[PDB]
Amino acid sequence: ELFRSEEMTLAQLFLQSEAAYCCVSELGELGKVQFRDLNPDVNVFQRKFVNEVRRCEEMDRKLRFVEKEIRKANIPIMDTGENPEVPFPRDMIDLEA
Amino acid sequence: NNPEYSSFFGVMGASSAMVFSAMGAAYGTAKSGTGIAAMSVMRPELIMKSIIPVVMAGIIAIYGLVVAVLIANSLTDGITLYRSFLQLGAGLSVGLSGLAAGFAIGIVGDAGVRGTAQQPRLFVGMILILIFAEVLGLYGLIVALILSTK
Amino acid sequence: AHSFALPVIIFTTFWGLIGIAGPWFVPKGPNRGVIITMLVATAVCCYLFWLIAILAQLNPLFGPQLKNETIWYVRFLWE
Amino acid sequence: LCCGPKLAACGIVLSAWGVIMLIMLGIFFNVHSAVLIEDVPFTEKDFENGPQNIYNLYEQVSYNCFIAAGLYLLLGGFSFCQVRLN
Amino acid sequence: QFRVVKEPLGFVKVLQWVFAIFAFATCGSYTGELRLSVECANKTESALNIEVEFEYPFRLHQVYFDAPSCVKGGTTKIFLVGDYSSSAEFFVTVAVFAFLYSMGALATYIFLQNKYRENNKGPMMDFLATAVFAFMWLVSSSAWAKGLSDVKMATDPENIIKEMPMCRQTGNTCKELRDPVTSGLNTSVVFGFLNLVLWVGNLWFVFKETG
Amino acid sequence: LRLWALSLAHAQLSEVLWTMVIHIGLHVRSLAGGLGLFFIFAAFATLTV
Amino acid sequence: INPAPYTVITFPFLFAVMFGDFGHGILMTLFAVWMVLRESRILSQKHENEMFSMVFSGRYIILLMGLFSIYTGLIYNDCFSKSLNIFGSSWSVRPMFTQGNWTEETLLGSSVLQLNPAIPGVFGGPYPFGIDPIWNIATNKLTFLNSFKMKMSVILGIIHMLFGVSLSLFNHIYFKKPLNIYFGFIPEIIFMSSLFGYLVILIFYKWTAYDAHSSRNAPSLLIHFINMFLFSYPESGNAMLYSGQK
């Protein structure tokens, strides 16, 4: 006996969307499950979640601008850590607002 | 006892070795330099990191000497008629092998280095093929040594 | 002067003992299998290449040569 | 301050490797009397008498290594002194 | 303190130190000479005085002597046999190492008594270090015994004269003049044997003291 | 045989480097022996690295 | 099949046999430990030099190569084209003027001369560890340092092709495909072994077959293989190896 490639197989998944937000958050926290696309013929922008996509984009742009400001302020970062501190509220939207 | 015109072939081999080796290294430096000039306008920060083929041309150069110093040290003012033709063959073989390896390494390096200026990550296969062209020169040095063995 | 049976015997027992005893003394673990494989592999490659290395000087078919300064020097050297 | 560690770490490692190399080499020249197995070339032409002058010449050859070894100690000292400046 | 000075450990350790600094020191500077003559049939070509010197590390294998060949006025060089610097070099080099370690141990005894009486752990280190040194002393004593016996029936003039290629012809008579003196060899092996047995005694005392 | 070739080439290039740098540094006088060893050995180090 | 666990070792030792220098291996291991002991200090640092990023990404590979280069340098008994007196000389050619019929022709004359292994009192057994330094001091050392290293590299490659072949049979065990094994794998192993096993056994036998007293009528090194493939077996000077080998 020796070590071959590992073992894994497709298993379906039912989940209510409201709890699915937190479900996929946790699944990504674990990092140990693949993902795939089940609706290939539809366009990426036709998935209708592009609203979340471009609001992510605009927070990204705002954060880039304040990053440039801080680089002009020449204030170094400290990296306190605590990597798992990303919660799941809708309060993030008006916080970034 | 021996016939005259003994050292002629030995010295001729010694000269031809370096002449052809230097000529190959010259063409290598040619192609490399013009390639760096070609790419540098848009990627000024890759210029130091894109300096591979020239030092490889210098490795064909250090090969030139290892063979030049060997043939020079073996040279004396007396030959048994066996080392004369031997030295000539060694010099011709090593010189032209350096020439051909320099030609290959130069043009392929120019093409590759001036091509990676757009796509960064393909850069490694350039060194792969380049140093295969270098192992060609290594084979040249091999035959030089086995020829000086006798 | 030197022997061949004594050196070949001592080193083959050394490396064979290393290889055979390798797997057993390791405690149970997930790193155990890979360690066993690399230990047996290094044992075998080292041992075979050592066999050819020691055979390199066995039953010579030709006698080396030397210089004349080397003649007198080696004559007045060891032994 | 002057002569920062960026341009002196190379000097430190070079001096360390050089002192160890030179000390071992001098040990080989002295103790082994420079057997041909470790050192073929010499500096003389006439050996009419015997090995005593060869041994003496190898003794002074082994002596010649100490000066360079101490020089490398001195270079390492200067390099480390420059590194200590910050 | 004086209590440990009166304790056998300090006196005993100092005793082995003085025995060693006598023994290996004398071993490192021994020397001697033996004399020979090859009084061939012709007085003009005969040899009456030959000197050959032996000295530390006792590498008899490259010792030699140049004597007239007695054939038409020639001369030949002949080299003795026997390589004894392996065992001897091992013994003296490791004896120097043991001397340095003895200096360190004595320094720890006299200056670091407080760090010596803590946890009774360093005594164990000293114990197995001395045990390795004692095993070494035994094996090197055996090697030196075999070496000195080999030297004993190697330096005998019968071996070299039967090695003399040109003494087989009539008229080539050759008598040893001054025989070699081997006081150094048996004195030194006696010194080493005393050191070995006394280090064994030290080991036993340390085994009885570390409790 | 190309592994053998690389090993051969390495051995001979190291030998010629030794004969070119270290062997030429051999003279009786200590005045230059203890001084020029600096630059000859620095050259050896740079060439090998 | 995952050949990676075996590759863990199979890479560094080839790197080492190619890289035949002890001291260079010491320097490589010095660099490797300088990187490894600075693991955390390098994790905190950012790899601005991407070449250094690749170098760090495989330290373990680097230190494996370093250790195996040290090992190869040790067993070669070569270090910057020099060797040190560790074991005995292992030749001990004392009789040259005596037992060998020579007195004096040195200096201007007899500059170079070969010695006869046949004469007794000149052989000191094989050198226990590594190449005998007689080759290091010798002038035509390269002539025969070719031959055994040639054969050595060949032997190595043959062994590797052997177990590499066996791996495919293992693969076919785990797929349960005897269709491609019955008229398949076994013929490959027979075809490969019949030639390379023959070559390696020929060489092991040739090594200890003959001695210095039969040197000037001994078999060649490789020409007999060429004759074997040529189908031509003249009896003139047939250097017979074992009885009935035809």
- For E154, counting Cβ atoms within 10 Å of its Cβ (0-12 exposed, 13-18 middle, 19+ buried), the class is middle
Q: What is the largest CA-CA distance in chain B?
A: 70
Residue of A7, A2, C37 lying closest to G173 (CA atoms)? A2
Q: Under 8 Å CB-to-CB from E84, ≥6 apart: which residues?
A: E57, E58, E59, E60, E61, E147, E150, E151
Contact criterion met (CB < 8 Å) for G137 and D38: no
Amino acid at G175: F
Give the Cα separation of G72 and G75 in Å (integer).
Answer: 5
Instruction: Map out the domains of chain D as residue ranges.
Output: 1-86
Q: What is the resolution of this structure in A?
A: 4.3
Tokens 């890289």 — which residue? G19
Give the Cα separation of A62 and A50 in Å (integer).
Answer: 18
Q: Which of residues 9-28 of F touch D (CB under 8 A)?
A: 23, 26-28
How many residues does the structure list for chain D?
Answer: 86
Give the Cα separation of D31 and F41 in Å (integer).
Answer: 22
Q: Under 8 Å CB-to-CB from D60, ≥6 apart: which residues?
A: F28, F30
Q: Under 8 Å CB-to-CB from A19, ≥6 apart: which residues?
A: none
Give the Cα separation of E189 and E181 in Å (integer).
Answer: 15
- For G169, counting Cβ atoms within 10 Å of its Cβ (0-12 exposed, 13-18 middle, 19+ buried), the class is middle
Give the Cα separation of D2 and C56 in Å (integer).
Answer: 56
Residue of A67, G133, B44 lying closest to C57 (CA atoms)? G133
CA distances from D29 to D73, E138, F17, G115 (A): 20, 33, 20, 28
Give the Cα separation of F28 and A84 in Å (integer).
Answer: 72
Contact criterion met (CB < 8 Å) for C57 and G127: yes
Amino acid at D12: I
Q: Which helix (H) or strand (E) holds E173?
A: strand E173-178
Contact criterion met (CB < 8 Å) for B142 and F20: no
Q: Is G211 left (phi over 0), alpha (psi -120 to 50) or beta?
A: beta
Nearest 5 degrees, angle CA E151-CA E152-CA E155?
A: 70
E and A touch per CB criterion (3+ pairs under 8 A): no
Q: What is the largest CA-CA distance in chain F?
A: 48
How is residue A13 annotated by DSSP?
-
Q: Is E181 left (phi over 0), alpha (psi -120 to 50) or beta?
A: beta
Residue of E209, E25, E28 lying closest to E130 (CA atoms)? E209
C-alpha torsion A64→A70→A76→A79, nearest 10:
-40
Yes or no: say if E73 and E41 are a contact pair by the CB < 8 Å rule: no
The three-class DSSP label of residue E174 is strand
Give the Cα separation of G133 and G118 in Å (integer).
Answer: 20
Q: Which helix (H) or strand (E) holds E54?
A: strand E50-55
A and G: number of Cβ contacts within 8 A:
9
C56 contact residues in G (CB cutoff 8 A) = 126, 131, 148
User: Would you list the DSSP string of chain B?
Assistant: ---S--HHHHHHHHHHHHHHHHHHHHHHHHHHHHHHHHHTTT-GGGTTTT-HHHHHHHHHHHHHHHHHHHHHHH--S---SSHHHHHHHHHHHHHHHHHHHHHHHHHHHHHHHHHTTTSSTTHHHHHHHHHHHHHHHHHHHHHHHHHHH-
Residue G4 CB neighbours (<10 A): 10
How is residue F48 annotated by DSSP?
H
Residues of B60-84 as b/e, b for ≥16 C-beta within 10 angstroms? Answer: bbebbbbbbebbeeebeeebeeebb
Amino acid at G160: H
Give the Cα separation of G17 and G72 in Å (integer).
Answer: 6
Give the Cα separation of B81 and B6 in Å (integer).
Answer: 7
Give the Cα separation of B145 and F9 in Å (integer).
Answer: 8
Contact criterion met (CB < 8 Å) for D41 and F23: yes
Q: Rounded to an integer, what is the distance from CA B124 to the centroid of its chain?
A: 22
The three-class DSSP label of residue E178 is strand
Nearest 5 degrees, angle CA E196-CA E200-CA E206?
A: 140
Touching chains, C (3+ CB pairs < 8 A): A, D, E, G
How is residue G212 annotated by DSSP?
G
Residue B53 CB neighbours (<10 A): 29
- For B125, counting Cβ atoms within 10 Å of its Cβ (0-12 exposed, 13-18 middle, 19+ buried), the class is exposed
Give the Cα separation of E199 and E101 in Å (integer).
Answer: 14
Contact criterion met (CB < 8 Å) for D32 and G133: no
Rounded CA Rg of chain G:
25
Residues of B88-105 as b/e, b for ≥16 C-beta within 10 angstroms? Answer: bbbbbbbbbbbbebbbbb
D17 contact residues in G (CB cutoff 8 A) = 27
* Omega of the bond leading into E57 within 30 degrees of 0 (cis): yes
Q: Under 8 Å CB-to-CB from D36, ≥6 apart: which residues?
A: C70, C73, C74, C77, G137
Contact criterion met (CB < 8 Å) for F35 and D57: no
Residue of E75, E205, E191, E111 lying closest to E144 (CA atoms)? E191
